Amino acid sequence: YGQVPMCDAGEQCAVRKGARIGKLCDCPRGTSCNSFLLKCL
Numbered sequence: 001y002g003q004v005p006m007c008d009a010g011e012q013c014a015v016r017k018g019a020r021i022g023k024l025c026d027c028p029r030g031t032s033c034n035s036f037l038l039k040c041l
Helices: none
Strands: 014-016 021-023
Touching: none
Parallel strands: none
Antiparallel strands: 014 021
16 A cells, blocks of 8 residues: 655656645655655755
8 A cells, every 4th residue: 555656856756736746756765755846856
């Protein structure tokens, strides 16, 4: 439960649009999911 594709540092890990965020992949250890930039920061 919660398994997701490994996300890259610049690759989009979640899309912020419409209202809620669209999860795509998890950010690599050391990088978080920026809902404003949509990057692994």
